[PDB]
Amino acid sequence: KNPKSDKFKVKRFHHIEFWCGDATNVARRFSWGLGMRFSAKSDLSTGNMVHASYLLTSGDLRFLFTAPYSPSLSAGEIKPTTTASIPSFDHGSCRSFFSSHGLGVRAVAIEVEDAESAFSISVANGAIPSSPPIVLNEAVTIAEVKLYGDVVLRYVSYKAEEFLPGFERVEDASSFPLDYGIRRLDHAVGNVPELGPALTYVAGFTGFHQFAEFESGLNSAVLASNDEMVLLPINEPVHGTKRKSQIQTYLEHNEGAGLQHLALMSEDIFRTLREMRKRSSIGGFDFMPSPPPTYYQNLKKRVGDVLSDDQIKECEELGILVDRDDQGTLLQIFTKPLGDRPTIFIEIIQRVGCMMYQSGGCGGFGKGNFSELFKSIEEYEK
Amino acid sequence: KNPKSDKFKVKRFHHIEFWCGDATNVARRFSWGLGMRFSAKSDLSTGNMVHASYLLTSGDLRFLFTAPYSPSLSAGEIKPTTTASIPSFDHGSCRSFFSSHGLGVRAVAIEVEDAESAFSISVANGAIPSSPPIVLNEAVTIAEVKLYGDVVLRYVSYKAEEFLPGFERVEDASSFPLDYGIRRLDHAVGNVPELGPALTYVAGFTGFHQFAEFESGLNSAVLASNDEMVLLPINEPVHGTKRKSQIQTYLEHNEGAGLQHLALMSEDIFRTLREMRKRSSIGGFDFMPSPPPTYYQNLKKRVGDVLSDDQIKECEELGILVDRDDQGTLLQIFTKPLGDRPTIFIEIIQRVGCMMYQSGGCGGFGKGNFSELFKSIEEYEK
């Protein structure tokens, strides 16, 4: 059931912004590790005396990395005279965020029809304002409201139809055309202490509806836009369990609520994982430990009608997990944490089924893999 | 003239420590960009609840990357019960350093005979204490005094003859054996507002002597240990010049004095630069713009007795600079800044001559390349 109750017109995920201490080193690491191209910049070389911001792209996926310069470079400026290309940026906020949480996502940005309208309607419906709508070069409007923790939901709307005004396209020489097959952001997941109030708040100001699914440490629910292409799952810990909840570990090391993982859709998850795994120990990303061979033996019964034996063997080579709901099949895998703290990580996913284009959330989010992994673990021990 | 006046026994450069906001991402970037192996760690997985520290090595070169965890993880600890492996570490100091300077070198570490003695003699001779001598597992002693800005000179001495107690050697799977030919730290250069008082201070507490050399924005002098293997050049700006002093730009963007560049000796600078340049646009380091072909035409007259025409052509392919004093010849090249700010960069060098082993500083530090670059630039315009 989809009541299509969005309180304003939402289009797609637009970009994800990391707040960094040094944007250069994180962006270069991510670029090599994920196969994303350097495509735009806003920094000292473009006249920005406030923050360094670097944009990586892969297909429609946009990762933005931002860090503050010394406030002294911009001490003479006021907001009317700012050289920052992202007017919501604040030195104090950024330094406080990174010292509190370490490396992580500050903004989940979605493209909307009218960012000013989205902001007003959101705040009229309970959203906590973070940055009011601001029109950039009469061309783009940006506004921000609180999502959870110190993460903001950023609205962006374009007059037209180049990232943001004041950003410059990156020279071909510095722009190497890496591509490991990642194409878009599928969903972005938050961890909170209490799921109920988080859901009530966000669904309250967006109109996003609960996306239907079908003890492992969590309870979760997924909020979705009208066409279910913007997908925002939220987790809370389950306490008292045998193994300590990974959601609770997140909350402790992150100093509270925040974004837990980003799921990146690949047009060819086997190629993506071959390319990422080649680079794990030479600057890229590590992956969680692979499931036992029992897991892959059990894949024949569960998805033998969707994947060939070879395709299943290819999953085993790369440590890919498989889940299935009543509509489609999901291939997925999780990286180890992206930085020092056991907080944010990345998921790579590919979905098969639900053709009309492919409908959002086809195959679910892999909740069946909690129990299937436990099963296959015990089976393998025997 | 070398009066050999060291006030305590100094051996060699031991390691360089960067203070980071996220040690993981900087270490992985540097590892890929410079061809250094991950060789030791101290972090949550080793019981360190205070800081994440990762060690890269290439030959005898040791780069350490450290960032703080949330203070909450160690809120119950006191210095007697600390889980930090580097007892001089302080959350507040580290966060203040990185917010003030951005990514940069906190510690220039030299190995000495007796770090406690070196500390006492240094402080008796004017050194400003930063961290008193502390004995780690009855095996290693570490102490720190102020060098310039917020950079410390770190003394380390070993009972024996494994980096530091509490660090664990990195598993082979996570340790990929990268090597682009870098072998040791040749020298470490600081920028200060006033050269005179900086020299008087450091030479005062070390006994390091001035190393002899032979308007470009700077004045400089080099301090050296007894065998001239520890080399610490220091720069001050020269004001009023046509082009603004790069030393003054450093001081402004760094919020004052600090380490300007690290010079890394390569056993084969042509291989090092081929390997580094291959990776510049895929996560590694960029290099300063190459000198004009006139520079390389003029190399025949200056070093045609040291490098063949092919070897000179190989320099031109890679943008290498060449200088020569009365004792030897120097090959060198400079990276663009390592992070967001136009502050710290790296120099790659190889020295030819002064065989006895090779004596320290053979060929100088390339001061002749300021004027030779200006000449070759004007010549090329014609």
Ligand SMILES: CCOC(=O)c1nc2ccc(C(=O)c3c[nH]n(C)c3=O)c(C)c2c(=O)n1-c1ccccc1
């Ligand atoms: C312990 C063995 O490993 C699991 O069993 C395991 N299976 C998973 C299945 C699906 C998803 C997911 O992406 C979503 C689930 N719900 N929604 C909305 C999602 O987006 C995730 C995040 C996991 C996961 O993290 N782990 C997991 C790994 C290491 C430690 C602790 C836990």
Ligand SMILES: CCOC(=O)c1nc2ccc(C(=O)c3c[nH]n(C)c3=O)c(C)c2c(=O)n1-c1ccccc1
């Ligand atoms: C402008 C054209 O480029 C130069 O002319 C140029 N030549 C150099 C020669 C030697 C050394 C060096 O490594 C030491 C010099 N003295 N000591 C003790 C050293 O270790 C350095 C650091 C440079 C250097 O930075 N630039 C330079 C580059 C870009 C902007 C502004 C300046």
Ligand SMILES: [Co+2]
């Ligand atoms: Co997911």
Ligand SMILES: [Co+2]
């Ligand atoms: Co130098």
